[PDB]
């Protein structure tokens, strides 16, 4: 093949990743070839979300997740696990009490204290089982995802209402204990802009962890970013700030969301961002492209026929 291997262009800056579907992983399939050719880091689009792994209490299905991991092993890609604890794509059973009522709806102080304990157990068991299964095979775990409201207050999810603010630290310790080799990330969107309240809440929390000894290695910036905003300057201060805490940064779902002028504009923004990422490659340990957009898993980069798009030539 005559075009450059994307991940090679970024050697000794950072790995380049994509999220995949377990259906698309056969040698027969050009998708799988495009993945193996261009990327050296992989995430499960959905196979490792809570609802995928533990549909019912204590019932696990690892089929698709295993296929994805095996794919990474074969091609020697870094595996991101996504995600251990989240308020979305999480089965209802998790948050039901003894009788099968919403735990959230409990008023009695003695029973709440009992619900708290069951949820901690459930959270930790899920963590131990999943991280335990994949022990040593996972470059980085997204241990928690989207813990913040956009205003920078903690999200009032079931996790938070029942366990209270501790669930996060608890998820991180349990992950650390199950697989010490895995980098532990806290992931979110709207945390690219240093001036944003959210980005600052996340800084404060992470700082707190680093100072209190709570294991955390990295912050995951989703990187749903527009053409003009946030400014490269604003992003830079964010990278500097977190890197000052001694945590790594990953861009976990990079996306710069029709016509011929449209494409060339997005390609230039991407050029710019990648310039900025390269400038700070010491602080950044992976860039994964968002890819649900049928369009490829890296829709920014490769057309529906697997041909390079403007954006791809912009960054190589």
Author numbering: 9 to 265, 270 to 305, 318 to 340
Sentences from the paper on this structure:
The design method is inspired by the evolution of new enzymes in nature through recombination, insertion, deletion, and mutation. It starts by computationally segmenting all structures belonging to a modular enzyme family along structurally conserved sites and assembling the resulting modular fragments to generate a huge combinatorial diversity of backbones.
The active designs spanned five orders of magnitude in catalytic efficiency. For instance, the most active GH10 design xyl3.1 and the least active one xyl8.3 exhibited OPNPX2 hydrolysis efficiencies of 9417 and 0.61 M-1 s-1, respectively. The high-activity design xyl3.1 was also atomically accurate throughout 13 active-site residues that form an intricate hydrogen-bond network surrounding the two catalytic Glu residues (<1 Å all-atom rmsd), and indeed, across the entire protein, with a total backbone rmsd of 0.7 Å. Furthermore, missing electron density in β-α loops 7 and 8 suggested that at least parts of the active-site pocket were mobile, although design accuracy was high throughout the segments of the design model and experimental structure that could be aligned (0.9 Å backbone rmsd).
